Amino acid sequence: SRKTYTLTDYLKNTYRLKLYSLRWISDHEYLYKQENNILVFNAEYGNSSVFLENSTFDEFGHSINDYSISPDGQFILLEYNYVKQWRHSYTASYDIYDLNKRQLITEERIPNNTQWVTWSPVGHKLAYVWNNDIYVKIEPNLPSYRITWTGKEDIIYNGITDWVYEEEVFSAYSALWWSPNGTFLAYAQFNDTEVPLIEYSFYSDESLQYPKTVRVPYPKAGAVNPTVKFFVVNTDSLSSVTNATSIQITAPASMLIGDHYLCDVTWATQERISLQWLRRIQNYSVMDICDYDESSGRWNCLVARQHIEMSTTGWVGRFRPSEPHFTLDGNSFYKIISNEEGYRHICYFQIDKKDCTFITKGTWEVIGIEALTSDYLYYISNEYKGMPGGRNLYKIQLSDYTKVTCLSCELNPERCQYYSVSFSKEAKYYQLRCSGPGLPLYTLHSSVNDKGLRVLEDNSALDKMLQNVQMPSKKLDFIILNETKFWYQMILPPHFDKSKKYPLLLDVYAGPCSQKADTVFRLNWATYLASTENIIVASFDGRGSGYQGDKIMHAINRRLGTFEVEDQIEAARQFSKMGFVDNKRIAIWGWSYGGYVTSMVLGSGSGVFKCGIAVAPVSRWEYYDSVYTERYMGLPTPEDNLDHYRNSTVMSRAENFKQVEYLLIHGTADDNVHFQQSAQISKALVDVGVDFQAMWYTDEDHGIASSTAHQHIYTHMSHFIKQCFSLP
Amino acid sequence: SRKTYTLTDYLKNTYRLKLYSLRWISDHEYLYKQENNILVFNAEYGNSSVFLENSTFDEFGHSINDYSISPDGQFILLEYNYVKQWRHSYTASYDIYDLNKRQLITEERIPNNTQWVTWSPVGHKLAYVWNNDIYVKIEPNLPSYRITWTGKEDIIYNGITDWVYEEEVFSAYSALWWSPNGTFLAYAQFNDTEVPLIEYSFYSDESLQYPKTVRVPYPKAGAVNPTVKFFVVNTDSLSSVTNATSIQITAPASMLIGDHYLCDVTWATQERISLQWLRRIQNYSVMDICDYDESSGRWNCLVARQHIEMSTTGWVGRFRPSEPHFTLDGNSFYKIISNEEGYRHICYFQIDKKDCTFITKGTWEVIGIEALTSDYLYYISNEYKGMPGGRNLYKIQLSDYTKVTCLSCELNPERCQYYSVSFSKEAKYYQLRCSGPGLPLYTLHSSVNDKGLRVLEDNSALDKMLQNVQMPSKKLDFIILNETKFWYQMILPPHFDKSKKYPLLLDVYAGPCSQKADTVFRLNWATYLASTENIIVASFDGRGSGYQGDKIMHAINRRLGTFEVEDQIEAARQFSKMGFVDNKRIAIWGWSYGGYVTSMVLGSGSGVFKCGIAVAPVSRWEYYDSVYTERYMGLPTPEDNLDHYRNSTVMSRAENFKQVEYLLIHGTADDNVHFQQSAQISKALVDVGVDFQAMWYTDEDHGIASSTAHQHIYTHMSHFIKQCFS
C-alpha cells in the first residue's frame, strides 16, 4: 500500500494546498472570501458575521468575477465580463452597488470594456480608464468627468502603463495614484508613437476563418523607448470649472538630458508626492520630493529634497530602484539600499538631508519593508540561521536600532522557515504566512505583544492524505566554491539511498537576483519526478543569484550567458562528486531565463548533460525588452556592449547541440518571450543539421498555463525525460 | 551484394537523372542551354552551332539566372536579381543584349523589380509589367508605352495575377497574351479590393530584431473573391503623345449574374480570340469567340457562337475547362471534354455549331492535345494496355478518325510506358520524353514518316551506377472493390520475397483527379525506405482518382474527406491480407492533401495504422482558398454545403488519435496551406489530451525545399518511421 505522487496526482491537482486570502478593510477587521458568500471577521475575537452572502447577488445573470468595496464602505464595485490581457492588465465590465439602500446603481454606469477602476483611498470617489483616457466619478451615480483627451490606442496611455512599464517597470497596470486624502489625482502618460510593434499571429477557435495579427508596442534591446510625463489634477475643482487643469511635474535636468523612466510614485502627505526617475542607463536614479504650492497651484520639487542613487558595480536595486516608506509626518522615510559591503539594508532618510543612516546589520539582506508605526518598523529578511533561502519577520525599535526582535523565527522552526505577512490598516494586527519547509501555516497576531491569536489554517487535511503516499524529501544545503558558499536544493526520492546512483534533473532559472534554492514547500512536477520516477531534481543558485549581496548578484553584470551558465554546469559536477549521481543520466531544464540557460548549457560542449528541455526560452538578448535587458546588458551598440550581445546567443552554439538530445517548446502567442526567439533557435539547428524534438502551443502565452495546455506539456515533457533516463 | 540506396544518397542527390530541355525556335531548329553557353540544333541532321559563350557576360557585374532570346534571334533578355515570390511569380532586374551589334542596350532600359516580361510571338517586341501596370516597347532601346495606369499593390493587378489566380486557375503569373503576329496584346485585370488578407509572421535572418508580418490577399472558402476584367490593346496604333486605348471585352451575360472567373484565353487567328468563363459554382462554363471589328475598333463576341460546358455530377474539367485548339482558319477547333459516360475525349467543334463530335472514344482518357496540323491531331492518352498509369503519344488522321496510330507504345515497351512530347513550331519534328518504368529516355523524330532520328539522352551514365546498388522494384497492379477496379503501386525492397513479412508505409495524396499509382521512375524518399530499410511503400488511387472517367473522379463531389479516405483504409486493409505485409507495422504519411487524408485516416479509428506523418496538411476546408475548395465543396453556407464543411475537419477526429503515433510537420511561412491549419490540429489534440510529435520549420514555405530544411525534415521523418517499425 502507500502509493506515490503520480503525474496525474500533479496534473489533476489531487493533493491541493489550502490558502487563506485575507483583505483588511479596517484596522480591526477583514473580509474573507468563501466562494459562495463573503463574510467579515473580527481580528480581536474571531467573530464570524456575514458582510455579504451568496444570494445577495443572485438573479443577476453575469457571474461576478471579482469585487472591491469602497473605503467608506457604502458602495461595492462588481467586476464582471473580465477579459485578461497581460500579466496584470485586463479589460472588464463594472457595476456599482449601493449598500445603504441595497440597490444596484443604474445611472451613468461605468463603460463596458473599461481598462482600470480605482476607488479613492478615502470616501467613495472613483477613477477609471476607458479608451486610454482617465475619467472621474465624484458620486457613484452622477456623470463622470473626462480628465484626458489625448488617449489613443497603442499610442497614448493615460492612467495605464504600456506593455513594458506594466511588466518591467511598475510591475503593475495602474498608472494613477490618488492622494491619501482623495483631493489630488496623479497620473503618468505614456507616448508610444515611436515604439516598434511586436507582431505575431493568433489563431483563436477553429471558427475563425482568418488568423488575427496581434501587434503590441514592445521596445526590444536598444530600440526606441516610450516617453513619459507626469500630471497631478485636483479632483475637488471638478465641480467648479468644467475642465480642471492637470498640472505637469517635469525634470530633473539630469533625467531630461536623455532617455529615462519613471520608476516610482508614492504620496508622502496630503500635499507632498515623491517621484523617482531613472536613466535608460539604469546606473543612476533621482528621487524628487514635491510639495503643493497653495499660492501658485503648482507643484514644486526642491533640489534640497532630491536624492540620488547610483551604482558602480551594477544596476540600482534588485529589479528597480528601492521603494520609499515615509513616516507619518512625511519628513523622513526608509529605503532599502546596498551598504558599503554590498548588502541590501534599511536606512533612514531625512527629506532634506542627503545622507541616510543604516539601521540594519551585515551579512544577510532585508527582503522588504512591511509596516511602519511610531513604535517599530516591521521587515522580512533572511538573517535567521544565516540561511539566505529562508524568510522571517523582524521588528526593529525606532528609538534604539540595537533592539531587533524576530517575530516568526521561533513560532515553529521545524515546519516554518519561510514567511510572508499582512498587517491590518494601522498595523494593530497581522497575518503570518508560513510556506515551508513544512505545510503552509496561516496564523493571526496582535502587534501589542505579538501574541499568537489563533491558527487560521494548518492544512491538517492535506497532512492526513500525504502520510498515505510516498512523498519525496528535500535537502537544503550549500557547497563552497572559490572560497565562497553557494546554496543548492535537492528534491530527493522516497527512501533515498546514498549508496545507489540516481539519475539527476537540474531544475534551472539562474536569472539575476533569482533564488531556486529555498525552504518553500512545493507540490510540482519535481515532486512527481522524485516520488514516482525516482529522479533527483536539484537546483543551484550560482553567480548572478540574489539575496546574498551584490558581490554575487552583480557577478554577471554586463555578462549574461556566462558565469550563471558555467556555475550551473559546475553544480552538476559537484553533485556527481557526492557519489549518488549516475553521470550517464544527468538532465537539465528551465523556463524562460531557465530555458535560456538550459539551452546555453546544452550547447557548451561540456559533456555533462545527456538531454535537456527549454521552455519559452530567450535566444538572443536583442529580442527581449529594453528595461530588463539593458538593465544588465547595457546597450547593443558597438560603443557600449554590442559585442557581448552577439556572443551570448543560443544560435552561435547550434553546432554543439549535436551531442545532446534537445527538446524545444514555446507558446505561439507569448507576448513576453516571443515565439520568434525559439523560431530563430530551430532555424539555426536546421542550418547546421542537428535533429531535435520540438513542440509549439497554439495561442498559449508565456505561462502555457491553460488547463489543457498545462497538462499536455508536462505529459510530453515527461515522456522525453523518462526516455532519456531509460524509464520506466 | 553491393550497397543500398541510402538516405544520404537521396538527400545529397548522388544519383542524378540526366535531362534534355530544348526549346524550339522554329520548325527545324531548337535551342539547348548546355553547361555555360547556349547552342542551336538542326533537328534534320543533329549538327549544332554555338549561340553565345555565356562568357560573353563574364564582366556583366551581375549573376544571370535566365536568358530569353527574342523570337527574332536578334535580342537576348538577361534576367538577374531574381527574387522568388510564389509558385510562378517573382521579381527581377533585366537587361537586353543587341546581337546585331553585340552590345548591351543602355538607353530606356527595363525597370528594376519588374514583375514580368515577355517577347512578342514573332519579332522582338516587349510587354512587361512593373508596379502592377503594363508597359510596351516596340523596340528594345526605345521608350516604353504605358498601357495601363491603374496598378496598385495588393489591390489592382494589370497583366499579372493575384495569389489565387496564380495558383488555382492560370498556374502562372503572366496575365497578358500576345496575338499570333504580335499586333494585339490581350490582358486581364484583377481587383482584389474587398478580398480578405491572410497574415502570418516571417522572422527572417537572426539579425532582424522584429518579425515582419507578411500579408497577401487570399480568398478562403466562401470569402469575397477578386473580380476580373479583360482588355485588348493594339500595339501598332499607339503614340507617345496619347494614352493607349484598351478595348474591354465584357460578358457573357450568363456569367455576370453572379461571381465568375476568367479561366482561359486562346487566340484563334490574328483577329479572333477565344475566352472561357467559369461560374463561381464551377458547374457552368462559357466560351466566347470574339472577333475584331476594323471600322469600329471593338471586339464582338457573337452569342450563338459561344459554347457552353456544364456538368451534373461535378465540376467542369479535371481542374478547369480544357484549352481549345483552333484550326488554321480558326473556324473550328478541337478540345477535350467529358463523355456522356464521363470519360474525357477529343471533341471537334465549329465556332457556329452548338454540338461537337467526338473523334476518340472508349474507356480510357486523352490526357491532352499536343499538336494540330491539317493532316493530324497529336495527343496523349492512357489507352495502351488499358492501364491509366501509362501515357503514350497517339496521332489521329483528321480525314479518317479510324486511322489512329500510336507513335510511342512500341519503341521500348519494357523501358517506356510513360511519355511526354514536344513538337516543333509546325510539328515537323517532335521530341519524345520517356519517364518510366525505366530510366528516362529522350529521342527525336520526324513527323513525315515517324522515323526515329536519333537518341538525345539515354541516361547510360546513370544506368551503370545503379546496377552497382541494390535498387528496389515497383509493382503496378490493381484490386477490385465491389465491381470496380482501382490501381495501386508498390515500391518493393531488393530481393523481395513474398514468403517474408515486411512493414508497410502507405504513401498517400488522394486528392481529386490525382494519380499516385503510375509507371514513372522516381528516385525519392520511398526508394531509400525500401532499398535501405526494406520497407514497402504503397500507393492507391481510390474514389476521387483521375484519368479513369468521371464515375470515379466525381465520386467525392461535394464530399471531400470521405471515400478517398475510407478507400485508403480499405486498400491498406486488403494489403495486410496479402501475406507479405506485417499487419502490426503499417504506417501512413502524406504532404498537403496527402497530409489531410493521413490525418483523417489516423483519426478514423480504423486501428489499421500504427503511426503516421502529416506534412503541411489541410485541417478544415474553410481554411483553404476559394477556387480550389469550392470546386469540390461549393460554398460553406447552410443553404449549400456548410454541413459537410463542418463534418470533414481533422480536429473533430481528435479523440481518435489516442490509438496512434502522430507526427505533425508544417512550415511557418506556408502561404498555400497556412500554418493556421496545423495550429488548429495541434490545439484540438491538446484539448482532447492526445500526446503527439511536432515539428515546425520557421520561414519555410509549402515546399519545405530549402537546402537545409529539406535534409532536416526527411531526417526527422526517417527516425520516426523506423522508430515506429523497430
Ligand SMILES: *[C@@H]1O[C@H](CO)[C@@H](O[C@@H]2O[C@H](CO)[C@@H](O[C@@H]3O[C@H](CO)[C@@H](O)[C@H](O)[C@@H]3O)[C@H](O)[C@H]2NC(C)=O)[C@H](O)[C@H]1NC(C)=O
Ligand atoms: C507623442 O510623441 C509624438 C512624437 O513621437 C508627438 O508627435 C509629434 O507632434 C508634433 C507636434 O506636437 C508634430 O510636429 C508638427 O507637425 C505639424 C504637421 O506635421 C507641423 O505643421 C508642425 O510645424 C510640427 O512640425 C510631429 O509631426 C509629431 N511627430 C511624430 C513622429 O508623430 C505627439 O505630439 C506626442 N503626443 C502627445 C499626446 O504628447
Ligand SMILES: *[C@@H]1O[C@H](CO)[C@@H](O[C@@H]2O[C@H](CO)[C@@H](O[C@@H]3O[C@H](CO)[C@@H](O)[C@H](O)[C@@H]3O)[C@H](O)[C@H]2NC(C)=O)[C@H](O)[C@H]1NC(C)=O
Ligand atoms: C480641457 O483642457 C485641455 C487642455 O487645455 C484640452 O486639451 C487640449 O485641447 C486642444 C483642442 O482640442 C488640443 O489641440 C490643440 O489644437 C491646437 C489648434 O489646432 C493646436 O495648436 C495644439 O497643438 C493642440 O493640438 C490640445 O492638444 C489639448 N491638450 C491636451 C494637453 O490635451 C481639452 O480639450 C479640454 N477639454 C474640454 C472638454 O474642453
Ligand SMILES: *[C@@H]1O[C@H](CO)[C@@H](O[C@H]2O[C@H](CO)[C@@H](O[C@H]3O[C@H](CO)[C@@H](O)[C@H](O)[C@@H]3O)[C@H](O)[C@H]2NC(C)=O)[C@H](O)[C@H]1NC(C)=O
Ligand atoms: C476595384 O473595386 C472597387 C470595389 O470593390 C472599386 O470601387 C468601387 O466600389 C467602392 C466600394 O468599395 C465604391 O464606394 C466607395 O466610395 C464610397 C463613397 O461614395 C464609400 O462610402 C465606400 O466605402 C467606398 O470607398 C466606389 O464608388 C466604386 N468606385 C470607386 C472608383 O471606388 C474600385 O474602383 C475598383 N478599382 C478598379 C481599378 O477597378
Ligand SMILES: *[C@@H]1O[C@H](CO[C@@H]2O[C@@H](C)[C@@H](O)[C@@H](O)[C@@H]2O)[C@@H](O[C@H]2O[C@H](CO)[C@@H](O)[C@H](O)[C@H]2NC(C)=O)[C@H](O)[C@H]1NC(C)=O
Ligand atoms: C547544320 O549543317 C547544315 C548543312 O549540313 C550539310 O548539308 C546537308 C545536306 C548534309 O549533307 C550534312 O551532312 C552537311 O553537313 C546547315 O544547313 C543549311 O541551312 C543553314 C540555315 O541556317 C545554312 O546556314 C547552311 O549553310 C545550310 N547548309 C547547307 C550545306 O546547305 C546548318 O546551317 C547547320 N546547322 C547548325 C545549327 O550548325
Ligand SMILES: *[C@H]1O[C@H](CO[C@@H]2O[C@@H](C)[C@@H](O)[C@@H](O)[C@@H]2O)[C@@H](O[C@@H]2O[C@H](CO)[C@@H](O)[C@H](O)[C@H]2NC(C)=O)[C@H](O)[C@H]1NC(C)=O
Ligand atoms: C534599380 O535599382 C538599382 C539599385 O540601386 C537602388 O536604387 C538607387 C536609386 C538607390 O536608392 C540605391 O540605394 C538602391 O540600391 C540601380 O543600381 C544602379 O547601380 C549603379 C552602379 O551599379 C549606380 O550608379 C546607379 O545610381 C544605381 N541606380 C540607378 C537608378 O542607376 C539600377 O540602376 C536601377 N535600375 C533602374 C532601371 O533604375
Ligand SMILES: *[C@@H]1O[C@H](CO)[C@@H](O[C@@H]2O[C@H](CO)[C@@H](O)[C@H](O)[C@H]2NC(C)=O)[C@H](O)[C@H]1NC(C)=O
Ligand atoms: C494618361 O492617363 C494618366 C492617368 O490618369 C494621366 O496621369 C494623371 O494625370 C493627372 C493630371 O495631370 C494627375 O492628377 C494624376 O496624378 C496622373 N496620374 C494618375 C494615375 O491619374 C496622364 O496625364 C495621361 N496622359 C495623357 C497624355 O493623356
Ligand SMILES: *[C@@H]1O[C@H](CO)[C@@H](O[C@@H]2O[C@H](CO)[C@@H](O)[C@H](O)[C@H]2NC(C)=O)[C@H](O)[C@H]1NC(C)=O
Ligand atoms: C497581323 O494581323 C493583323 C490583323 O489581321 C494585320 O493587320 C491588319 O492588316 C490589314 C492589311 O494587311 C489592315 O487592312 C488592317 O487594318 C490591319 N488590322 C489592324 C488591327 O491593324 C497585320 O498585317 C498582321 N501583321 C503582320 C506583320 O502581318
Ligand SMILES: *[C@@H]1O[C@H](CO)[C@@H](O[C@@H]2O[C@H](CO)[C@@H](O)[C@H](O)[C@H]2NC(C)=O)[C@H](O)[C@H]1NC(C)=O
Ligand atoms: C451546379 O451545382 C448547383 C448547386 O451547387 C446546381 O443548382 C441547384 O442547386 C440546388 C441547391 O440550391 C440543388 O438543390 C439543385 O439540385 C441544383 N440543381 C437545380 C436544377 O436546381 C446546378 O444544377 C449544378 N449545375 C448543373 C449544370 O447541374
Ligand SMILES: *[C@H]1O[C@H](CO)[C@@H](O[C@@H]2O[C@H](CO)[C@@H](O)[C@H](O)[C@H]2NC(C)=O)[C@H](O)[C@H]1NC(C)=O
Ligand atoms: C484633504 O485634502 C487636502 C489635502 O491638502 C486638505 O487640504 C485642502 O487642500 C486644498 C488643496 O486644493 C486647499 O485648497 C484647501 O484650502 C485645504 N483645506 C484645508 C482645511 O487645509 C483637505 O482639507 C482635506 N479634505 C478632506 C475632505 O479631508
Ligand SMILES: *[C@H]1O[C@H](CO)[C@@H](O[C@H]2O[C@H](CO)[C@@H](O)[C@H](O)[C@H]2NC(C)=O)[C@H](O)[C@H]1NC(C)=O
Ligand atoms: C554607469 O554605467 C554607465 C554605462 O554607460 C557608465 O557610463 C559611461 O561613461 C562613464 C564615464 O562617465 C564610463 O566610465 C563608463 O565606462 C561608460 N559606460 C559604458 C557602458 O560605456 C557609468 O560610468 C556608470 N556610472 C556609475 C556611477 O557606475
Ligand SMILES: *[C@@H]1O[C@H](CO[C@@H]2O[C@@H](C)[C@@H](O)[C@@H](O)[C@@H]2O)[C@@H](O)[C@H](O)[C@H]1NC(C)=O
Ligand atoms: C464580535 O463580538 C463583539 C462583542 O464582544 C463580546 O464581548 C467580549 C467581552 C468578548 O467576550 C467577545 O468574545 C464577545 O463577542 C462585537 O462588538 C463585534 O462587533 C463582533 N464582531 C463581529 C464581526 O460581529
Ligand SMILES: *[C@@H]1O[C@H](CO)[C@@H](O)[C@H](O)[C@H]1NC(C)=O
Ligand atoms: C454593456 O455592453 C452590453 C453588451 O453589448 C450591453 O447589453 C449593455 O447595455 C452595455 N452597458 C453599457 C453601460 O454600455
Ligand SMILES: *P(=O)(OC(C)C)OC(C)C
Ligand atoms: P523570462 O524568464 O520571463 C519571466 C520573467 C516570466 O524572461 C527573462 C528575460 C527574465
Ligand SMILES: *P(=O)(OC(C)C)OC(C)C
Ligand atoms: P496541397 O496538396 O497543395 C499541392 C498543390 C502541393 O493543397 C490541397 C488543397 C490540394
